[PDB]
Amino acid sequence: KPNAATRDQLNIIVSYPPTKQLTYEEQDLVWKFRYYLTNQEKALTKFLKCVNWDLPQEAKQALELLGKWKPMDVEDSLELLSSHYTNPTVRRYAVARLRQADDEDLLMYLLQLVQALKYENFDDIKNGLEPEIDSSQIITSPLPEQDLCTFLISRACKNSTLANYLYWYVIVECEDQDTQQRDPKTHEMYLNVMRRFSQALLKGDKSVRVMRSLLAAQQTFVDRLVHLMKAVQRESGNRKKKNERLQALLGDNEKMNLSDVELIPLPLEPQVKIRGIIPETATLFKSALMPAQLFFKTEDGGKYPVIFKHGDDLRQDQLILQIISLMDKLLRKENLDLKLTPYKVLATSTKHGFMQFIQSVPVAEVLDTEGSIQNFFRKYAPSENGPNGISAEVMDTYVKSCAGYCVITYILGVGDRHLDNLLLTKTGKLFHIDFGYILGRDPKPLPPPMKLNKEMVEGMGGTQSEQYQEFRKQCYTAFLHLRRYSNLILNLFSLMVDANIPDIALEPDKTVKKVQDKFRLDLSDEEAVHYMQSLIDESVHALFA
């Protein structure tokens, strides 16, 4: 029905990011050719955005069109679960489309889906109970029935990994005392989700009932570890005495039940089943907050070191590591493995939680003990035939992880980057830790948008090396890949705006735009490549000037 000119304009509208507000003219255009648009699954979110849900005649027709639309993709369904959708039929449609995801993808979204329960009908949850262009770089830069609660519990009953995270994510929401004080009905809702969850597990078959007892075992274990950390952190004396107390309490299994337990899924990574904590290798970090390093004995004879923080809110780190995990999985789906280190983070309360400990050396220590990253690589991965006398595999891994983290920390606006938050493995993996400053916040004024340093660049042989050329190519390639998933990434951030995460809570209404602006969606792919190269070029020039 539309001509080539309106079809061109409709294509622009359907192309918009999920964040873009349609003008009155665009809404009218979308609504007029709604029947024409039923063929385009990507047009459905735009159409639903044109509906005045508070006008009954309009809602009725929008729901008829909803039933006739080419079904929308999983990633678009996340937009229908935000606070901007109340219509029960729309929200059920979202779950029906979300349900086509496999559990691997669902797990990538689950932190946000647990936030989205805030936007569901709280009575239904309760009732279920039983109560620009650089010419010289053109040629060198070629282009490459159920509601949400019922649904999540249903999938969790069938998948112990999903059940693990659903349990702990909900526990943390229940313990959020800001939510308790300021939004008591939301606190009640999360309690009811947990009661619904427990009730469903108790009704299941033999292994589903065992899942309930394993979550209880984990909760009890974590409670004991918290009791231990309180005892250690209040112990009289100095650090020697505190470490001795830490190890003595861990060694007293009859008292504390932390060093010799029947196999329990590790909350941090429930695929890993643990036999207890090794008493003799546990110590406190020197940090004044006294987190502990703890080595878990695993089912298969391994050791899994963690950081257990007590007295500290891990939720911002948890979100950032969950998003880095997602970005890594999206890049890998595009067959780009940049050797990233999305270490696990799991809050077990609003004031304690786990991080996966990655063996590595802080770059500041690399420099102080070996003088440079290349000297470090030459010491631990020598290769006579390799670049600068370093193993080609290690250098490749370094260039790739450098590019991946440059692009990812740029998108996430990570600040407070110093050489003790940058870690390096002897296999060449560079990675970032400690995400207390995100979305453009920095402890110093005028943080640069791009977080590079001379040491990284010298590590890849300087700006004229082959490795540096490959670094730049990996940067703009990862950038183009992540732009292609900007709808999904932005939809997930939109679900976090009411989370009590410090750097989001500061300006919830501006949070998603802080991320969107970094993708430069106003730029074509070709323009975006030159933008990213100007970013790197300007950053590196400043380092050496």
Ligand X SMILES: CC(C)[C@@H]1CNC(=O)c2cc(-c3ccnc(NC(=O)C4CC4)c3)nn21
Q: Please, what is the minimum distance in Å from the beta carbon of residue 285 to ligand X?
A: 4
In the chain the first and final C-alpha atoms are separated, in Å, by: 60
CB-nearer residue toward ligand X: 85 or 343: 343
- Strand 352-356 relative to strand 303-310, pairing: antiparallel
On the 0-12 / 13-18 / 19+ scale of CB atoms within 10 A, 198 is: middle
CB-nearer residue toward Na ion: 306 or 536: 306
CB-nearer residue toward Na ion: 59 or 278: 278
Q: Please, what is the minimum distance in Å from the beta carbon of residue 317 to ligand X?
A: 5
Lay out the site mask for ligand X across 358-377 (x = CB under 6 A, - = otherwise). x-xxx---------------
Q: Is residue 265 a contact partner of residue 351, using CB atoms and an 8 Å limit?
A: no
CB-nearer residue toward Na ion: 282 or 331: 282
Write out the E strands in 321-448. 345-347, 352-356, 361-362, 422-424, 430-432
Positions 257 through 296 that interact with ligand X (CB under 6 A):
285, 287, 291
Positions 478 through 497 that interact with Na ion (CB under 5 A):
484
**C-alpha atoms less than 13 angstroms from C-alpha of 330 in its C-beta half-sphere:** 24
Given ligand X, Na ion, none, residue 99, with its beta carbon under 5 to 8 Å by kind, binds Na ion
Q: Please, what is the minimum distance in Å from the beta carbon of residue 176 to ligand X?
A: 20
CB-nearer residue toward Na ion: 105 or 442: 105
Q: Measure CA 145 to chain center.
A: 29
Q: Measure CA 196 to chain center.
A: 26
Positions 291 through 350 that interact with ligand X (CB under 6 A):
291, 307, 317, 343
Q: Is residue 319 a contact partner of residue 496, using CB atoms and an 8 Å limit?
A: yes
**C-alpha atoms less than 13 angstroms from C-alpha of 533 in its C-beta half-sphere:** 25
Given ligand X, Na ion, none, residue 281, with its beta carbon under 5 to 8 Å by kind, binds Na ion
> Which of 305, 304, 314, 433 lies closest to 362 in space, CA to CA?
433
Given Na ion, ligand X, none, residue 355, with its beta carbon under 5 to 8 Å by kind, binds ligand X
Given ligand X, Na ion, none, residue 68, with its beta carbon under 5 to 8 Å by kind, binds none
Q: Is residue 532 a contact partner of residue 424, using CB atoms and an 8 Å limit?
A: no
In sequence order, what are the beta bridge partners of 423? Answer: 362, 431
Of the candidate residues 32, 99, 195, 513, the single one contacting Na ion (CB under 5 A): 99
Q: Does position 357 bind Na ion by CB under 5 A?
A: no
Q: Which residues, 6 or more positions from 210, have their beta carbon under 8 angstroms from its beta carbon?
A: none
Q: SS3 for 277-307, per residue?
A: ECHHHCEECCCCCCCEEEEEEECCCCEEEEE
The site for ligand X, by CB under 6 A, has a size of 15
Q: Which residues, 6 or more positions from 490, have their beta carbon under 8 angstroms from its beta carbon?
A: 17, 18, 19, 512, 515, 516
CB-nearer residue toward ligand X: 169 or 343: 343
Positions 266 through 285 that interact with Na ion (CB under 5 A):
278, 281-282
- What are the φ and ψ backbone dihedral angles of 383, each rounded to 5 degrees? -150, 115
Q: Please, what is the minimum distance in Å from the beta carbon of residue 240 to Na ion?
A: 16
CB-nearer residue toward ligand X: 317 or 503: 317
CB-nearer residue toward Na ion: 282 or 460: 282
Lay out the site mask for ligand X across 515-544 (x = CB under 6 A, - = otherwise). ------------------------------
Task: Please count the other Cβ atoms lying within 10 Å of the Cβ belonging to residue 111.
Answer: 22
CB-nearer residue toward ligand X: 69 or 343: 343
Q: Please, what is the minimum distance in Å from the beta carbon of residue 360 to ligand X?
A: 4
Q: Is residue 512 a contact partner of residue 490, using CB atoms and an 8 Å limit?
A: yes
Q: State the residue for tokens 């590079």.
A: 452
In what order do the strands lie in the sheet containing 422-424? 361-362, 422-424, 430-432
Of the candidate residues 31, 295, 357, 531, the single one contacting Na ion (CB under 5 A): 295
Of the candidate residues 249, 423, 488, 535, the single one contacting ligand X (CB under 6 A): 423
> Which of 191, 153, 201, 358 lies closest to 269 in space, CA to CA?
358
Given ligand X, Na ion, none, residue 278, with its beta carbon under 5 to 8 Å by kind, binds Na ion
Binding site for ligand X (CB under 6 A): 285, 287, 291, 307, 317, 343, 355, 357-358, 360-362, 423, 433-434
